[PDB]
Amino acid sequence: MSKFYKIWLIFDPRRVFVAQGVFLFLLAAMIHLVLLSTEHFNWFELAAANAA
Amino acid sequence: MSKFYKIWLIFDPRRVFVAQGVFLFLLAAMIHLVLLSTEHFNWFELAAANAA
Amino acid sequence: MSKFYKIWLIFDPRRVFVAQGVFLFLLAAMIHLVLLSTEHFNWFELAAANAA
Amino acid sequence: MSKFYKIWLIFDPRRVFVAQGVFLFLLAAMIHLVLLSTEHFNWFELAAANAA
Amino acid sequence: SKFYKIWLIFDPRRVFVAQGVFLFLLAAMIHLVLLSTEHFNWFELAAANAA
Amino acid sequence: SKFYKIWLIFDPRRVFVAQGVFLFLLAAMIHLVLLSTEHFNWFELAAANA
Amino acid sequence: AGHVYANAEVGVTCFTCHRGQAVPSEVWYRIDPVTENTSGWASVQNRATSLSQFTSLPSDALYQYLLNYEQIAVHDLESRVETLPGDPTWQNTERTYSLMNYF
Amino acid sequence: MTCTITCWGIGVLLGIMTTVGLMVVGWSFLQGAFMGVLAWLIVGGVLAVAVC
Amino acid sequence: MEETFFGNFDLASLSLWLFYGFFALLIYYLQTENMREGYPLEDDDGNTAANQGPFPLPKEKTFKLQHGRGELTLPGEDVQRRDNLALRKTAHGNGFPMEPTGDPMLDGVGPASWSKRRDVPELDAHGHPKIVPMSAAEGFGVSAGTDPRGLPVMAGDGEIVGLVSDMWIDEAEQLVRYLEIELDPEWGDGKRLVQREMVRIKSDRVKVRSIYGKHFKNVPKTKSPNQVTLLEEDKIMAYYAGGTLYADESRLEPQL
Amino acid sequence: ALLSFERKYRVRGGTLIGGDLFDFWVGPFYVGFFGVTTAFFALLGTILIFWGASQQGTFNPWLINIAPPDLSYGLGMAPLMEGGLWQIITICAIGAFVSWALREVEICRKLGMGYHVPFAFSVAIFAYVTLVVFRPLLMGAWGHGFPYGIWSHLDWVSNTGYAYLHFHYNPAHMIAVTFFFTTTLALALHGALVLSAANPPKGEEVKGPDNEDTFFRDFIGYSIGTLGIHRVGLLLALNAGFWSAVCIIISGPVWTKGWPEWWNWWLEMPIWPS
Amino acid sequence: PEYQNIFTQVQVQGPAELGVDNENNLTEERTTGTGFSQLIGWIGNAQLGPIYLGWFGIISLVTGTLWFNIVGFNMLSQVGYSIPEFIRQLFWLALEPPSPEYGLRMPPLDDGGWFIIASFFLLVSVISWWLRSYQLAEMHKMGKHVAWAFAAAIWLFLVLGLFRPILMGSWSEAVPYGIFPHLDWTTAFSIRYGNLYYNPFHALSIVFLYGSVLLFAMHGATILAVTRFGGDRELEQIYDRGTASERAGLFWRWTMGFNATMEGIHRWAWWFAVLTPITGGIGILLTGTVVDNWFLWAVEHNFAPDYTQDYGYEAYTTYDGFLGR
Amino acid sequence: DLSFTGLTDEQAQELHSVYMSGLWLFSAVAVVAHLATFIWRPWF
Amino acid sequence: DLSFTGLTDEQAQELHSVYMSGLWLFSAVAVVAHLATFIWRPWF
Ligand code: BCL
Ligand code: BCL
Ligand code: BCL
Ligand code: BCL
Ligand code: BCL
Ligand SMILES: CC[C@H]1c2cc3[nH]c4c(c3C)C(=O)[C@H](C(=O)OC)c4c3nc(cc4[nH]c(cc(n2)[C@@H]1C)c(C(C)=O)c4C)[C@@H](C)[C@@H]3CCC(=O)OC/C=C(\C)CCC[C@H](C)CCC[C@H](C)CCCC(C)C
Ligand code: HEC
Ligand code: HEC
Ligand SMILES: COC(C)(C)C(=O)/C=C/C(C)=C/C=C/C(C)=C/C=C/C(C)=C/C=C/C=C(C)/C=C/C=C(\C)CC/C=C(\C)CCC=C(C)C
Ligand SMILES: COC(C)(C)C(=O)/C=C/C(C)=C/C=C/C(C)=C/C=C/C(C)=C/C=C\C=C(C)\C=C\C=C(/C)CC/C=C(\C)CCC=C(C)C
Ligand SMILES: [Fe+3]
């Protein structure tokens, strides 16, 4: 576990960070879109609903 | 920590600046659009509603 | 057994890690999506039902 | 037979292991999906049925 | 008695992979043939024997 | 007779693979035809006897 | 009334089809022998006539279906059926297609 | 080219003129277009052969 | 025919699965037949790669080459490999672009890279060289379009380097393959060939936008002025396309 | 890995908006700025399809069906489970397709080859674009796009085809189909020509361009040549894609009536002696 | 902009190329007259080559004209030899197959009897043309790929008009010889037997038909992209590959992760083209004979989508609202 | 002593230290963001 | 000594130890995750 730094001995930092950067934004959009799809967690609908 | 400046040692400042500039505007345009799609957060329609 | 380390003499660590990284996330995603398909384990709908 | 080891003199270990790896998961996924198709062994509705 | 001479004609690499997919497709086909049958369907029997 | 001269005409490698595919496809076809028939369907017949 | 009074109370009057002329428009006659030197199915369809909706579909569809009570359905109600003589064919489908194109 | 391209240009201009010329005296756009297209093929080909 | 066997698996289903098995064999056959060139795989260091893919290399097929050029077996020992490439890796790992050590266009490494083809001219059915100057052609002449002979040649940067002296035609298929450029003494010497597919012919001048004025003096030459070998033919074509990326930094650098 | 000749061609440069930041290869694939956006858009669109499949209740690839909203919603955004997800996947699909074409520009720019392939793909993109965003705007409702299902989008073609009363009489469909059949006819003959010349009967020398050039001269009396077939074939396929775009863009917003009734101009002309 | 190799900017014309010839001695049956056309030369070869007057070709041409004429004179007899009406209804007239109440028996001339005669001559012409392709490849010492690719088109051609009607029990299952009528038959065939969208072999043929157009746009553009490296000379690139084959391969290796060779591309190109009528021929052959309703076949095999929304316009709008009143 | 990227242990340790520092900071904000949403609308 | 990837016998042994250590850490998180889900909503 303490030797996890060796991942950079096999993966180029400027080649996996592009993959790492894309993957995070892919998630950040994915769950946000999933939440907006649900009726309970759609914060845009809730503001309209709370306004009566 | 404070050693985040090393990102420029592996990522070119010119290309990152252009890439984030496109990304930031596309992010800004997209979020402005989803606000317009919602009836509650469409500031253009609300002015019509308050006009009565 | 203790001689499982020889898989890296057959498989390139670089290509396996990206292969399992893609495989694990896809497996992680589809198991999550399978749960959301079921009405019993859909934690988004359960939260809505609990609020009532 | 004690002489089954000679299969590796015929088959390339790299191609076999990749082919076996994808085959085993596709085997595992299919059998899991067959259980999900049956009403008796689908543990997702069984959890719902037990919870009544 | 001397069937071993088949490998003098057939390439062992091509034959072994040939029956490797053939034998599995025998298992897949026959297993699904049983599953289609109402009698030899162990998944349906377990539901039936559950009562 | 002396039918062994067929191998002077046909390539043994080319005819054995063709025969192997033909023999299995013929066997599968004949087996499948019996399944379609009501009298010789051993799966349906076994259910009938039970 | 199950048809004229289908959705609302909108009936049929003498003006509904005549529309101010003695002979109501869009009336049809039997022109089944559409083309010469033909008989059977070849004699009703291979031409663009008034009854065919600008198509080469049969022109006898109105006569056979709206006047002679011929069978309009052509589909088979099972995935596999024993196709026996007398069953509807693609010619009958083509004629039904001609009638229903007029609809 | 040059002469052939110009001769084709004369035909398409003539085809457009015939398209609207027959529309004035009746006909329809589609009926006039066919004569206009037909005129473009005929006089355009004849001019591209005889003049050039 | 109209009756089903073991379930809903009728003859249509049997034909469908029979095609599925045939298609899988066909894809294996089709994919393998494409592995006769460029295989086995390698890494950026030139060694044999640990991964060769799921498709094994096919059995050796032989082509009986014509005009007495021997035979040819595709799988194994590509004779077209170039030995001394003027490149070195920009990264210690794999998957990263190479940076040329010297002049990319002169060394022919990037888009300017050629392939070590045969050093003999391509032959038609008669055995004669396939591409010859129109001066040596028996009864060939321009039938349509603008004749570029005598028109000045304008480079990518607008410089005038010379006038077209001749076009190297393909008498076997009756089309123009090259234009001969007689370089002015300022911009070079001798004659050079530019492929027709890289040149644009206008009414008064003929222009190439891929190569600047200063790079014509370094265009690869031909040993003989009457025929071009496949090696020279590959070097000449590659050089012009290499200038689409190496004529100036503006082409290599990002456009936005 | 790399092919036996790939090392030289792997040089830096030839990027549109990206630089050395994204100028690298992942396996055989080339990543660029537009390969980054392709990966993001394709993964987001693919995941959202399976997310919609999960909420649809089935994961069967045949039965997965993400459909556009109702026509009552107009051109505005719909609820995610009521058609809004289809709109986002469409936005992701447009981004994935455009970036893929722009990435192909980066591929060919790095290799010094022409831009014919990205242009040819753009025609196929235009056929998809005219099906999902152009035709709906001309009708004022996003619900006219085809649903994102393996068999659901076949129902849309069937219903849209019969929504114009025997679509076979559509003049642009008539032109588009005969381009599709000719392209396959041209593909078969061209593929046969090269294979036949390169693969003669055993014990025979391989045939050069002259032998294959004269084969159709003896076959159909005219051979278009080795170079001619590729350019005419590209135009045959691009015309098939372009005229397919036309036949569907003129269906609703141009000719709301039946397609056989379009041919009434030919049947009813003054020249014809009625 | 850079010169795109779509239209040649200059073309040269020399002595006409007759042919290569060998001891098979194709010259006697080869025409001695050739012509040149500059209009077609902007995109391809400008030479109108000489026909090889073989006996398979002559028989195919003569019997093909007989089928063409027989259909034509029946069409001319449809409208009573009225040429203006014949021209007006040219796209609508046809030679209809026999009525279904005749079976395989020979029907009267006015009720499909001339259809059988025309079909027989068409069958002879089509087969003779295939024999011409096979013989021409044999006489040129070339591969028979043209003959085999053509034979795939014959398969669907024979299934549509010969094989299926024979084992369907009636000649009425054949396709009418008309412009619009065989479009009507195409639609009525799908309607009668459910929906050919749900025919898996129709779907498979569509997969290869789109793939065939897809490949030949891919191959057409890729070769034109490497034509600056002599990529149009595919045959020489097969025997001795240059940078044209390498760049074309690396374009698709860097794009979609795998590529082909300059020869392996045409094997891919050949098979999708060949598979388009082979799969379609199978689907038509077992349509009606085996499966009489394809949507119901889809329903029982669980690949027909199900829709939970209402099927009426009243459920989405109203008649007054649609009219705007 | 394999190094596919040509990075020494000291170079990788320094580079991994910053990456984990960023990873914890990115996850720390996510934990706070997730905590606020659970207070707003719990999903359990 | 068989080595298709060029790694030595000792190089693969050390790489496997870290990979297996990561595998156990990934599995340990999943095991804790499964228990929390089982307590929240069992599936047996
Ligand atoms: C449902 C209740 C809340 C909600 C609950 C949550 C929760 C809970 C969380 C978020 C999180 C996030 N939410 Mg939210 N969120 C909601 C509504 C929104 C709305 C909105 C308009 O309504 C927006 C804009 C966001 C946006 C965000 C992002 C700030 C963040 C996820 C980061 C990511 O995906 O990409 C990040 C990935 C990247 C790699 C992007 C790369 C792009 C940049 C420009 C690259 C620059 C790199 C360059 C080299 C410079 C480097 C410099 C470095 C400093 C060294 N949320 C609703 C209202 N949201 C998650 C989060 O991560 O928080 C930290 C989080 O935990
Ligand atoms: C049903 C009840 C719970 C539920 C129960 C569970 C359970 C039980 C589990 C999960 C698991 C997971 N859940 Mg869940 N889960 C639910 C709802 C959610 C929600 C949500 C918004 O509602 C989210 C976001 C998640 C998300 C997750 C992830 C944390 C995790 C899946 C990892 C995987 O598949 O990919 C694997 C990822 C990869 C291999 C790729 C990683 C990509 C990185 C960026 C690659 C770069 C690496 C680079 C080289 C640097 C490496 C450095 C290293 C330090 C060496 N769950 C519901 C609420 N969830 C499963 C899990 O995996 O737990 C660990 C798990 O066991
Ligand atoms: C309800 C149970 C099903 C059944 C379910 C399966 C399943 C499931 C599988 C097989 C498999 C096979 N079955 Mg079984 N099988 C049944 C009935 C038969 C009968 C028969 C005449 O009834 C025969 C000939 C077979 C033969 C076979 C071979 C094709 C194969 C075994 C390996 C092999 O190839 O060895 C080669 C053969 C020899 C060299 C001699 C060994 C003889 C075989 C193994 C014994 C079967 C003989 C059988 C018991 C005769 C019964 C008659 C008795 C006199 C009453 N089965 C019954 C009907 N069978 C496996 C396979 O690979 O399929 C591709 C598979 O996965
Ligand atoms: C009842 C039905 C009517 C009918 C109604 C319609 C309707 C309705 C339509 C057509 C359209 C078409 N018809 Mg029609 N048509 C009928 C009968 C026929 C017949 C026949 C023999 O009977 C034929 C051959 C055709 C032929 C065609 C083509 C002209 C066209 C098909 C679409 C196309 O060109 O691509 C165009 C589509 C694209 C090129 C897709 C672009 C793909 C994108 C860019 C890439 C996809 C990437 C994707 C993500 C996959 C990646 C995943 C993996 C990673 C690889 N029709 C029947 C009678 N026809 C369709 C059309 O024209 O569309 C424009 C159309 O909408
Ligand atoms: C409402 C209409 C039905 C329909 C009904 C049919 C029917 C019916 C058929 C097809 C078939 C086809 N359909 Mg469908 N099809 C529909 C919708 C579509 C759509 C779409 C977008 O909607 C598409 C793309 C297709 C696509 C296709 C192709 C995949 C396929 C034919 C390939 C072909 O050319 O074979 C090539 C072969 C031929 C065209 C004939 C070969 C001709 C011979 C060899 C040449 C003789 C030349 C002749 C003598 C003239 C010579 C003159 C010269 C000038 C000298 N269909 C709908 C469902 N479809 C075919 C099929 O099923 O294939 C399995 C078919 O029979
Ligand atoms: C457009 C003109 C013709 C053509 C040309 C053509 N297509 C091309 C090209 C060219 C020249 C390429 O260079 C490019 C390529 O690289 O192919 C290998 C491509 C291509 N055309 C393709 C397919 C394709 N082409 C088709 C047809 C055609 N190809 C036309 C006839 C068809 C049809 C009509 O059936 C299909 C399906 C791909 C193989 C490829 C495009 C690859 C691509 O876009 O990759 C990026 C995207 C992904 C990996 C996935 C994106 C997923 C989305 C974000 C979500 C889903 C969206 C989709 C609309 C859902 C569909 C649901 C159901 C309807 C199935
Ligand atoms: C006497 C003239 C008459 C005849 C003949 C006639 N219709 Fe109608 N039809 C009506 C009337 C009146 C209505 C109005 C019912 C309403 O919608 O409430 C109507 C309505 C309809 C409707 C319902 C439309 C709606 O808005 O729901 C359909 C569909 C219909 N007709 C089809 C047909 C068809 C098909 C035929 C030929 C078989 C036919 N009609 C023949 C009089 C007729
Ligand atoms: C469905 C529409 C329908 C309705 C209802 C209807 N008719 Fe008719 N009528 C017809 C048709 C069809 C004909 C036949 C055409 C013909 O005879 O010219 C006809 C013929 C007639 C004729 C003969 C016209 C001539 O050519 O001399 C008269 C008179 C007539 N209608 C009177 C009436 C009257 C009066 C009413 C009002 C009660 C009425 N019809 C309503 C359909 C209808
Ligand atoms: C569909 O299903 C539903 C249920 C919807 C679903 O949601 C499924 C969800 C699923 C499956 C979750 C899958 C998510 C997973 C697995 C989470 C991965 C996330 C990870 C791992 C977080 C990495 C964070 C790393 C950072 C952010 C570092 C910061 C880096 C810093 C900032 C800079 C780096 C340092 C330098 C550049 C300097 C060094 C350089 C030199 C010294 C030169
Ligand atoms: C100035 O000109 C004059 C002179 C007037 C003139 O003529 C002009 C001629 C004019 C306008 C006719 C133009 C013809 C037109 C538009 C028809 C298009 C044709 C089309 C679309 C064909 C579709 C169907 C094709 C199939 C699918 C066939 C199947 C054939 C099968 C395979 C044959 C099988 C054989 C038999 C059934 C025989 C069996 C018997 C024995 C073996 C004995
Ligand atoms: Fe080609």
Numbering used by the authors:
A (entry chain E), B (entry chain D), C (entry chain F), D (entry chain G): 1 to 52
E (entry chain I): 2 to 52
F (entry chain J): 2 to 51
G (entry chain C): 156 to 258
H (entry chain O): 8 to 59
I (entry chain H): 1 to 256
J (entry chain L): 2 to 275
K (entry chain M): 2 to 326
The study reports:
The authors present a cryo‐electron microscopy structure of the RC‐LH1 isolated from a marine photoheterotrophic bacterium Dinoroseobacter shibae. The RC comprises four subunits, including a three‐heme cytochrome (Cyt) c protein, and is surrounded by a closed LH ring composed of 17 pairs of antenna subunits.
By using cryogenic electron microscopy (cryo‐EM), we determined three structures of the DsRC‐LH1s purified in salt‐free, Mg2+‐containing, and EDTA‐2Na‐containing solutions with global resolutions of 2.7, 2.7, and 2.8 Å, respectively. In particular, the DsRC‐LH1 particles exhibited stable forms in Mg2+ and Ca2+ solutions, whereas most of the DsRC‐LH1 particles purified in salt‐free or EDTA‐2Na solutions were severely disrupted. When incubated at 50 °C, the DsRC‐LH1 samples in Mg2+ and Ca2+ solutions showed higher thermal stability and the relative intensity of LH1 Qy absorption at 867 nm decreased slightly within 90 min. However, in the DsRC‐LH1 the residues αn‐Asp49 and αn‐Ile51 are replaced by α‐Leu46 and α‐Ala47, resulting in the inability of Ca2+ to be stably bound at this position. This is consistent with the observation that the DsRC‐LH1 samples purified using Ca2+‐ or Mg2+‐containing solutions showed no significant changes in the absorption spectra compared to DsRC‐LH1 samples purified using salt‐free or EDTA‐2Na solutions.
